[PDB]
Amino acid sequence: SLCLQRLQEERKKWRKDHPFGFYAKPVKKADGSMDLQKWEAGIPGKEGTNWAGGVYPITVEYPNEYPSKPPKVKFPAGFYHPNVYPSGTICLSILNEDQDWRPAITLKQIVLGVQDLLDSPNPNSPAQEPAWRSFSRNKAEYDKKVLLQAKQYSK
Amino acid sequence: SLCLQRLQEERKKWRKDHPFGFYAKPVKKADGSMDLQKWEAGIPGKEGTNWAGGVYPITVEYPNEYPSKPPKVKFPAGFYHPNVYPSGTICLSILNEDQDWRPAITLKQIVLGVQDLLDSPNPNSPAQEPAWRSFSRNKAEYDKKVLLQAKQYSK
Amino acid sequence: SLCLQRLQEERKKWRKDHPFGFYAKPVKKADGSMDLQKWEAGIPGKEGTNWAGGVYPITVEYPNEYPSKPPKVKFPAGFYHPNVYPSGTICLSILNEDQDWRPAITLKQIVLGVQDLLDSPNPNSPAQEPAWRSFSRNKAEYDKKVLLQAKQYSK
Amino acid sequence: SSLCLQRLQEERKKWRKDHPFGFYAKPVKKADGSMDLQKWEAGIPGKEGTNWAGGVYPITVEYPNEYPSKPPKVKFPAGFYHPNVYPSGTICLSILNEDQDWRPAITLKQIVLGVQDLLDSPNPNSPAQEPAWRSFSRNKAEYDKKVLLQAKQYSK
């Protein structure tokens, strides 16, 4: 099983070194064992941005075909960002098997890619109508919502 | 009002030279008068495509600032197409004030632009998650849905 | 036009008598006249509740058959409350023609009824999955969201 | 052509259904989001246990109107380093030469594996690149250092 072997390697690599303020670990099953194909992680907002102070939770679901196919990465449904679907699914070219996904991509690369996305939305992939509208038409309103969401996910 | 004068012109104009199989009309108010700023229209699917035989209803909402600003065009909420948000809002650059909107654009050009979009989804507008997923990963499933939606909106 | 006669009556009535903290007015069309069948209003949260401090914006859409048929009342799409659909449509007994709508119901009655709903969600109208789930499963999380939304709509 | 586009549809299906780990290949998208069946982008992973390992080397595959009678043209980026790759990026490979081993039945998988095999095993009969061929033939240490860094350049 390449998928599970790769996920064990990812666990070992992450535990050894990962970016400051981020976390990621397999979820526990009913028996206390790890579900290597489903992880919970957290992405800190960047200092100096309206995202600062929040730690935004994601789930990473690795399909059976991983690493040939990318994991699905989701914020909570309703998370506010122009490139995040209503379901929470993150729209990012590195997570798209037809675009920039490659099997060598590490969890560290994914979580930093998502962190970078927060304060720098992509205009070729608006996935959420109200956030994209405010980001583009009413930046003051967009910024207020971002700062309130940072508070929602703050300690 | 420039807006209402233009809408009168669009109305009297549409009623003489409109694309075959399409319809468009201001909606009626409580007193049977026309709401010039809110129309109902219908877009026929092209023959030779899976959209054939349907006539897909849209509402066209003209803001007070029209024609300086574009109208908003919506299919029913839940309409299935990669470029149509959950609300029914259609993503089309000619309806975007920072891209291709120009005050001269006529309703005819708008409806034809919506028609063209049906069988050729734009990859820069990932507006509807499942429709994109199917379009990209399970084209047979995508086509089957399109075919059934054509029946939904048939005669 | 029984509808528009009733709506002109409702307007004059509102301007001479309305609860403190509330506002309501027909929207303006492109020529500066009033669209009597579409109003924008605001509902203050009541003091001593987690909704306190917010003024929550609504649209009131009166159908041609009003007052025989109730108006449709909507918060912004995405507004958080167990009885508010994703579209922002409010579920309330007095706004349902098969329930407690009566043609004699005034705008004051409607807006006070919406105000009452804010702090008392109805379990037989679970319109919003995450809001209902937090209200049932995680009161602390439910309350925090309400308090942040109050700030969002604060003065 | 018309056989050309029909064949290319089939190639896309065969590939999309089945191909070696770490390779990718897809028609490029046109301005309307539709596929250009006659120009694909692909990636060739270096073989593990060679100085090419860890790289995924990008190629373009351009199918002429007369495909599959005539072979596609396959190019690495201009300035790619390998003794059998011209300055333009064009790969010199027998199965890609109509005057040598091209046959209409050859599939994309066979092309990309042929290119992969060529990486660590240059053909002296196609010295397409002076500096690469000279280093390969006269200063192997220098050649290997360049190959290793180029693997980093295109790191998987």
Structural tokens at position C36: 């009597």
C40 and C24 Cβ atoms separated by less than 8 Å = yes
- How far is the C-alpha of A81 from the C-alpha of A115, rounded, in Å? 12
Q: Kindly list the residues from chain B whose CB atom is less than 8 angstroms away from the CB atom of residue D32.
A: 120, 122
Interface contact flag, B126 A98, Cβ < 8 Å: no
**Neighbouring subunits of C (3+ Cβ pairs under 8 A):** A, B
- How far is the C-alpha of B75 from the C-alpha of B84, rounded, in Å? 8
Interface contact flag, B37 C31, Cβ < 8 Å: no
Resolution (A): 1.8
Interface contact flag, B31 C87, Cβ < 8 Å: no
B51 and B29 Cβ atoms separated by less than 8 Å = no
Structural tokens at position A14: 């992450």
Interface contact flag, B66 C30, Cβ < 8 Å: yes
- How far is the C-alpha of A89 from the C-alpha of C140, rounded, in Å? 25
Where does residue D39 rank: exposed (0-12), middle (13-18), buried (19+ CB within 10 A)? middle
Is the Cβ of C148 closer than 8 Å to some Cβ of chain B? no
Structural tokens at position C1: 């036009």
Type of residue found at C19:
P
CB atoms < 10 A from the CB of C123, how many?
10
Interface of B with A in 107-126 (CB under 8 A): 124-126
Which one of C77, C130, C148 has the shortest CB-CB distance to A148? C148
- How far is the C-alpha of A78 from the C-alpha of C79, rounded, in Å? 11
Q: Where are the alpha helices (DSSP H) in C17-155?
A: 107-118, 129-137, 139-152
> How many residues are there in chain D?
156
Q: Of C76, C61, C51, whose CA–CA distance to C154 is shortest?
A: C51
CB atoms < 10 A from the CB of B139, how many?
10
Structural tokens at position C54: 């917010």
- How far is the C-alpha of D109 from the C-alpha of B138, rounded, in Å? 23
- How far is the C-alpha of A148 from the C-alpha of C148, rounded, in Å? 7
CB atoms < 10 A from the CB of D65, how many?
11
- How far is the C-alpha of D156 from the C-alpha of D154, rounded, in Å? 6
Interface contact flag, B120 D29, Cβ < 8 Å: no
Instruction: Give Cβ neighbours of residue D9 (< 8 Å, ≥ 6 apart).
Output: D37
Q: Strand D35-45 and strand A72-74: pairing?
A: unpaired
> How many residues are there in chain C?
155
- How far is the C-alpha of B75 from the C-alpha of B72, rounded, in Å? 10
Q: What is the CA C32 to chain-centroid distance, rounded?
A: 25
Q: How close is the nearest chain C Cα to the Cα of A96, in Å?
A: 27
- The CATH number of the structural domain formed by C1-155 is 3.10.110.10
Give the CA-trace dihedral at B78, B80, B82, B83, to 10 degrees: -60
Interface contact flag, A104 D21, Cβ < 8 Å: no
Choosing from D92, D96, D128, D147, the catalytic residue is D92
Is the Cβ of D33 closer than 8 Å to some Cβ of chain B? yes
DSSP H/E element including C2: helix C2-16
C108 and C14 Cβ atoms separated by less than 8 Å = yes
The angle subtended at Cα A56 by Cα C136 and Cα A29, nearest 5°, is 65
CB atoms < 10 A from the CB of D15, how many?
19
Give the CA diameter of chain A: 50
- How far is the C-alpha of D115 from the C-alpha of A133, rounded, in Å? 47
- How far is the C-alpha of A133 from the C-alpha of C72, rounded, in Å? 24
Q: How many contacts does B have with D, using Cβ atoms within 8 A?
A: 9
Rg (CA), chain C: 16
Which one of A68, A98, A102 has the shortest CB-CB distance to D56? A102
CB atoms < 10 A from the CB of D22, how many?
19
Interface contact flag, B64 C4, Cβ < 8 Å: no
- How is chain A classified by DSSP, letter by letter? -HHHHHHHHHHHHHHH---TT-EEEEEE-TTS-EEEEEEEEEEEPPTTSTTTTBEEEEEEE--TTTTTSPPEEEPPTT---TTB-TTSBB--GGG-TTTT--TT--HHHHHHHHHHHHTS--TT----HHHHHHHHH-HHHHHHHHHHHHHHTB-
- How far is the C-alpha of B111 from the C-alpha of B103, rounded, in Å? 15
- How is chain D classified by DSSP, letter by letter? -THHHHHHHHHHHHHHH---TT-EEEEEE-TTS-EEEEEEEEEEEPPTTSTTTTBEEEEEEE--TTTTTSPPEEEPPTT---TTB-TT-BB--GGG-TTTT--TT--HHHHHHHHHHHHHS--TT----HHHHHHHHH-HHHHHHHHHHHHHHTB-
Which one of B87, B98, B126 has the shortest CB-CB distance to A127? B126
B71 and B110 Cβ atoms separated by less than 8 Å = yes
Instruction: Give Cβ neighbours of residue C93 (< 8 Å, ≥ 6 apart).
Output: C99, C100, C122
Q: Do chains D and C touch (3 or more CB pairs under 8 A)?
A: no
> Domain segments of chain A: what residues?
1-155
Which one of A78, A130, A151 has the shortest CB-CB distance to C148? A151
Give the CA-trace dihedral at C87, C93, C94, C100, to 10 degrees: 140
Q: Kindly list the residues from chain A whose CB atom is less than 8 angstroms away from the CB atom of residue B92.
A: none
Give the CA-trace dihedral at A98, A104, A110, A113, to 10 degrees: -70
- How far is the C-alpha of D111 from the C-alpha of D95, rounded, in Å? 7
Interface contact flag, A103 D156, Cβ < 8 Å: yes
Q: Kindly list the residues from chain C whose CB atom is less than 8 angstroms away from the CB atom of residue B64.
A: 28-30
Is the Cβ of B87 closer than 8 Å to some Cβ of chain A? yes
Q: Kindly list the residues from chain D whose CB atom is less than 8 angstroms away from the CB atom of residue B123.
A: 29, 33
Instruction: Give Cβ neighbours of residue D126 (< 8 Å, ≥ 6 apart).
Output: D83, D84, D92
Interface contact flag, B87 A127, Cβ < 8 Å: no
Q: Kindly list the residues from chain B whose CB atom is less than 8 angstroms away from the CB atom of residue A85.
A: 129
Asked if D92 is an active-site residue, the reply is yes
Which one of C77, C130, C152 has the shortest CB-CB distance to A148? C152
Interface contact flag, A129 B98, Cβ < 8 Å: no
Structural tokens at position A40: 């919970």
Cα separation values, B140 from B2, B137, B146, C58, D97, Å = 48, 9, 10, 42, 37
Q: How close is the nearest chain C Cα to the Cα of A78, in Å?
A: 8
Interface contact flag, A127 B124, Cβ < 8 Å: no
- How far is the C-alpha of C137 from the C-alpha of C109, rounded, in Å? 32
User: Angle B107-119/B2-17 helices, nearest 10 degrees?
Assistant: 60
Indicate the SS3 state at residue C16: helix
**Neighbouring subunits of A (3+ Cβ pairs under 8 A):** B, C, D
C149: nearest CA in chain A? A148
A83: nearest CA in chain B? B126
Query: Which residue(s) pair with A73 in the sheet?
Result: A60
Is the Cβ of C4 closer than 8 Å to some Cβ of chain B? yes
Which one of C3, C29, C66 has the shortest CB-CB distance to B37? C29
C142: nearest CA in chain A? A152
Instruction: Give Cβ neighbours of residue D141 (< 8 Å, ≥ 6 apart).
Output: none
B108 and B18 Cβ atoms separated by less than 8 Å = yes
CB atoms < 10 A from the CB of C148, how many?
16
Interface contact flag, C3 B77, Cβ < 8 Å: no
Interface of D with A in 35-74 (CB under 8 A): 43, 56
C50 and C146 Cβ atoms separated by less than 8 Å = yes
Q: Kindly list the residues from chain C whose CB atom is less than 8 angstroms away from the CB atom of residue B31.
A: 1, 3-4
Which one of C78, C130, C148 has the shortest CB-CB distance to A130? C78
- How is B8-49 classified by DSSP, letter by letter? HHHHHHHHHHPPTT-EEEEEE-TTS-EEEEEEEEEEEPPTTS
| The CATH number of domain D1-156, selected from 3.55.40.20, 3.10.110.10, 3.40.50.720, 1.10.20.60 | 3.10.110.10
Cα separation values, B6 from A108, B3, C40, Å = 55, 5, 26
- How is A1-35 classified by DSSP, letter by letter? -HHHHHHHHHHHHHHH---TT-EEEEEE-TTS-EE
- How far is the C-alpha of B140 from the C-alpha of B136, rounded, in Å? 10
Backbone angles phi, psi at C13, to 5 degrees: -55, -45
D31: nearest CA in chain B? B122
CB atoms < 10 A from the CB of A69, how many?
15
